[PDB]
Design a protein around this ligand. Structure first.
Ligand SMILES: [Mg+2]
Ligand SMILES: [Mg+2]
Ligand SMILES: [Zn+2]
Ligand SMILES: [Zn+2]
Lengths: 193, 193
């Protein structure tokens, strides 16, 4: 019902997952959070954060790429379903980011609608390279950061609710082999204090 | 490695889920299938089909709406990752479909990027109404059907691989309270014979 309670639920759920003591095995009302994840993730966010049925509204694309339908999906959860928290969720060994890194090397983009994915991931890799980054996971962390920024800049409905106090957005990553959800970016009050 | 083996894996996995005897509790290589699902689904496809880690490449938007990034995501799995099967996965009590039905009644679309979602779901509801449909689940089944058609029409890379023998696309629905994955549409050879 607010960003503090929503983030508390996810943080505790990931503590239970990491501990190997889940409350909602195979997931055992209106959603607590929007999760914006990557299509090549190897594990469901509902497992990572140990949530039950209907707790999460989940949007997923290759490399977290955003177009109008992706944006409208997230805006729908916030404005229609009144969801109080958006989590941009990144992961280790992201293949989409590796594909973007490959295209930059070769100086040309792939064809068809695959172009549309790589051209939306490549800007973050280029910013990353300007700042001295060189590894897929470093680029993915930067791309999570940039994706949070894109969502606020492109959607007045999102940005207004964050300013107004009823929405927060966080950038979070995990490494599959350790399971910990690492909080990176946080815009709005989520009760960390 | 081909659409027959891919569909066999999913069908058997859903039989194990329904039976209450899963091999991959909390999900216990290159993906076996693309799943295109709805963001307001209440349960992960990895549970419904009892799959392990990395087995599924999952794209999700509100109401299965398609834009360039969604399409490119699916095309990426097929052309880069050589995934042999796309599953358009629908579900009961879909809120996005109910939101589209509401907008049609009122004769005007919602604002911001929410417009972009409802205007991509509304065409299926209108076709549904022309054919005498009236319930959310009937409209969702029709919308699964239309979404399979859209993917083939909009992507030459997808359509060519289906014609060529290396890709199939299926439309599947489930009702949460019974768990069964119901096969509705099937383009290509998936070994049902
Ligand atoms: Mg902060
Ligand atoms: Mg057929
Ligand atoms: Zn990824
Ligand atoms: Zn739905």
């Amino acid at each position: 019902t607010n960003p503090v309670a929503a983030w508390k639920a996810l943080k505790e759920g990931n503590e239970r997952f990491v501990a190997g003591r889940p409350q909602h095995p195979s997931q055992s009302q209106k959603p607590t959070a929007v999760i914006f994840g990557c299509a090549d993730s190897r594990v469901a966010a509902e497992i990572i954060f140990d949530q039950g049925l209907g707790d999460m509204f989940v949007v997923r694309t290759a490399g977290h790429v955003i177009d109008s339908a992706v944006l409208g999906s997230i805006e729908y959860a916030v404005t229609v379903l009144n969801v109080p928290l958006i989590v941009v969720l990144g992961h280790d060994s992201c293949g989409a980011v590796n594909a973007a890194l490959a295209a930059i090397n070769d100086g040309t983009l792939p064809g068809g609608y695959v172009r549309d994915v790589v051209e939306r991931v490549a800007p973050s890799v280029l910013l990353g390279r300007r700042d001295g980054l060189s590894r897929v996971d470093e680029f993915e962390q930067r791309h999570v950061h940039e994706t949070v920024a894109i969502l606020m800049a492109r959607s007045s409905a999102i940005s207004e609710r964050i300013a107004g106090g009823s929405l927060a957005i966080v950038g979070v990553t995990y490494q599959l082999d350790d399971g910990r959800a690492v909080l990176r970016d946080h815009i709005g009050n989520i009760g960390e204090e």
